[PDB]
Structure 1
Amino acid sequence: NLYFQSMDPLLSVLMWGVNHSINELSHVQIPVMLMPDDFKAYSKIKVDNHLFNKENMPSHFKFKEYCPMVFRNLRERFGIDDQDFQNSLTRSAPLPNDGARFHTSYDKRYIIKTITSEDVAEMHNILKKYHQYIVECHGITLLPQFLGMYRLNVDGVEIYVIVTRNVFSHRLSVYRKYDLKGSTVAREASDKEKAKELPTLKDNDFINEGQKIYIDDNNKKVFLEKLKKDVEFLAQLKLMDYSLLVGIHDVERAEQPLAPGEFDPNIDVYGIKCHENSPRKEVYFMAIIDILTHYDATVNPEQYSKRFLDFIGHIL
């Protein structure tokens, strides 16, 4: 039995709300197709308990789910069963990753990112086009896989969150992480960041530290082909300031019934194995992140995309 308990009341409201949201959708027929109204829909719940369940849950909170029918259909197109999703988000509390905060589900399958109200407005502005793009690629994309979007209110605090699939593996640990833009201005981790023992390194760190990505020509072509189409989609929406998140798993260093270095490509959908000539056995996890910044909110989206694709193409 689950109680949704947490020291962080926002996590309790999130778990309660995802549990509630998924159960509610079990009482709503699955439509033949989404319609325009589903992209402006929401469900809001306001809870006020008095002297009830008062050690597991906050007594007064609100939970709002945006476009529930759309995100349910996106989960299906991404191969995610609603009961599994519900269990991953509620069986045990999500864990913080240390404004641009994220949590990971306890089973490391999903990311919960705190976003702004402007980000929520931009997601609504692109949701029809994004959903149609996901339909056309059959869910195979390097874009983030958006699975749910909520507003939480508890204790005088109001936050928005979006749930995505983890770019990294739910099982294989990542020992080096980069956030790449192709901009060449202030793209280097701080000495504070580099003191954590999993820093997020940036463009000039990837160059200066001699980072290589050893993937064979077949996989590189497939990857860069996918990247081009995904970025061209973002540029058409006038989006910019997105990154390539690159995570590297070291097979021989995690050592000290899947065999070493193996991963389920239907769960870890962004993994690519290294080529046979790599100096260490590695697995790479690469995807586009932070896509919600609109142009008119210097380089324009067209120039940004060409600089991004050029840089990623040069580093392989």
Structure 2
Amino acid sequence: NLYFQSMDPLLSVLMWGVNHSINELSHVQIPVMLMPDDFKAYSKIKVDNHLFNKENMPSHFKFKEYCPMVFRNLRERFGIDDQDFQNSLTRSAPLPNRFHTSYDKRYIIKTITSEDVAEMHNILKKYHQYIVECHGITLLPQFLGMYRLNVDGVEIYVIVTRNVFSHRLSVYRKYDLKGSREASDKEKAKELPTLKDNDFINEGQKIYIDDNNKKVFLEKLKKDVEFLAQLKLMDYSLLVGIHDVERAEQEEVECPLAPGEFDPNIDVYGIKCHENSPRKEVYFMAIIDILTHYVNPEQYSKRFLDFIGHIL
């Protein structure tokens, strides 16, 4: 069954605490609406086992969940069931790349600083009201839970976000895009380099989405980017993953959803290529890495939109 075992005791506690958190919330009324106190709330749990479950789990740890009611509501508004979320993060250990990915590739887990946590509380009310008003249709990072772990006197804060990329379709090419930045020699020798602004230009990278999806996509991005500028946030990226249908076919032939198809209620950032693309590709594109508080944010926001618009 589920033992939450890992060589990494921080992962064990994270799996245990997400399991704990979600079961706890199963015993707490879903409120008609969130209230101000829910934006300053937490749960702290300290465990001290003696000669009990000593092989699977560390015997001494702390787990703290920030604003559990808000992040439950955000999961709901982003179309996530708490049971599915719990399974995604606990049924098997998250895999490392620094970030981790849930075993089913739905979710990203990232270590963050206490400043980041303090800045999350600073934006949390405004972020939640924005998510309500766009009915959860945004390119913004979906913040799904936020925790503090302590084991063996090692303290970390972690955020969970939705994977920009597909849980199923492989990404053969990947870009972190800002505007106004090229991968190192070391980065480029990996299997999947995180390529950057100059790699995008100098490799002659094109993205082939039809006028309609381009308009829809640049309309969200403008709204999301203007919201980030009102918050006075900057140094955020567009993450672009490219799925090449034909490369994934030959990669697999060596060893019901058709090739180049995805479920848009799971792979929410997916966009099909247009009819006249030289190759059958699927693009996965959203905003990551939002949380730098004040170029100025106006300037950052306009340069970003201008660079993304000039590449489509």
TM-score by length of structure 1 reads 0.97
3-state SS in 2 of match to 1:38: helix
Aligned-partner Cα distance in 2 for 1:15–1:67: 18
Aligned-partner Cα distance in 1 for 2:267–2:129: 23
Alpha-carbon displacement from aligned partner over 1:235-258 (angstroms, at most 9, x marks no partner): 000000000000000001100110
Alpha-carbon displacement from aligned partner over 1:174-207 (angstroms, at most 9, x marks no partner): 0100000002xxx000000001110000000000
Aligned counterpart for 2:110 among listed residues 104, 109, 113: 113
Aligned-partner Cα distance in 2 for 1:157–1:195: 32
Aligned-partner Cα distance in 2 for 1:155–1:247: 37
2:260 alignment counterpart: 261
- TM-fit CA distance, 1:113: 1.1
Alpha-carbon displacement from aligned partner over 1:83-118 (angstroms, at most 9, x marks no partner): 110001000000001xxx210000001110111111
Which segments of 5 or more consecutive residues in structure 1 lack a partner in the other structure? none
Aligned-partner Cα distance in 2 for 1:116–1:245: 22
1:163 alignment counterpart: 160
1:207 alignment counterpart: 201
Aligned-partner Cα distance in 2 for 1:237–1:207: 30
- Aligned length in residues: 307
Aligned-partner Cα distance in 1 for 2:83–2:38: 21
Aligned-partner Cα distance in 2 for 1:180–1:248: 14
Aligned-partner Cα distance in 1 for 2:267–2:133: 21
- TM-fit CA distance, 1:232: 0.2
Aligned-partner Cα distance in 2 for 1:122–1:269: 26
2:28 alignment counterpart: 28
- TM-fit CA distance, 1:36: 0.1
Aligned-partner Cα distance in 2 for 1:206–1:8: 36
Aligned counterpart for 1:181 among listed residues 178, 182, 200: 178
2:242 alignment counterpart: 248
3-state SS in 2 of match to 1:44: strand
- TM-fit CA distance, 1:157: 1.0
1:282 alignment counterpart: 281
Aligned-partner Cα distance in 2 for 1:207–1:157: 42
- TM-fit CA distance, 1:156: 1.7
3-state SS in 2 of match to 1:92: coil
- TM-fit CA distance, 1:41: 0.2
- TM-fit CA distance, 1:51: 1.1
Aligned-partner Cα distance in 2 for 1:171–1:133: 29
Q: Percent identity?
A: 100
Aligned-partner Cα distance in 2 for 1:113–1:208: 30
Aligned-partner Cα distance in 2 for 1:116–1:199: 25
3-state SS in 2 of match to 1:107: coil
3-state SS in 1 of match to 2:195: strand
- TM-fit CA distance, 1:234: 0.2
RMSD across aligned positions (CA): 0.5
Alpha-carbon displacement from aligned partner over 1:120-174 (angstroms, at most 9, x marks no partner): 1111100100000000001010001110000111112111110011100000000
Which segments of 5 or more consecutive residues in structure 2 lack a partner in the other structure? 251-255
Aligned-partner Cα distance in 1 for 2:12–2:154: 13
Q: Displaced runs of 4+ in structure 1, greater than 3 A?
A: none
Aligned-partner Cα distance in 2 for 1:112–1:300: 29
- TM-fit CA distance, 1:50: 1.1
3-state SS in 1 of match to 2:185: coil
Aligned counterpart for 2:141 among listed residues 144, 167, 173: 144
- TM-fit CA distance, 1:224: 0.2
- TM-fit CA distance, 1:220: 0.3
3-state SS in 1 of match to 2:301: helix
Aligned counterpart for 1:218 among listed residues 205, 212, 219: 212
Aligned-partner Cα distance in 2 for 1:169–1:115: 24
Aligned-partner Cα distance in 2 for 1:177–1:210: 14
Aligned-partner Cα distance in 2 for 1:112–1:146: 10
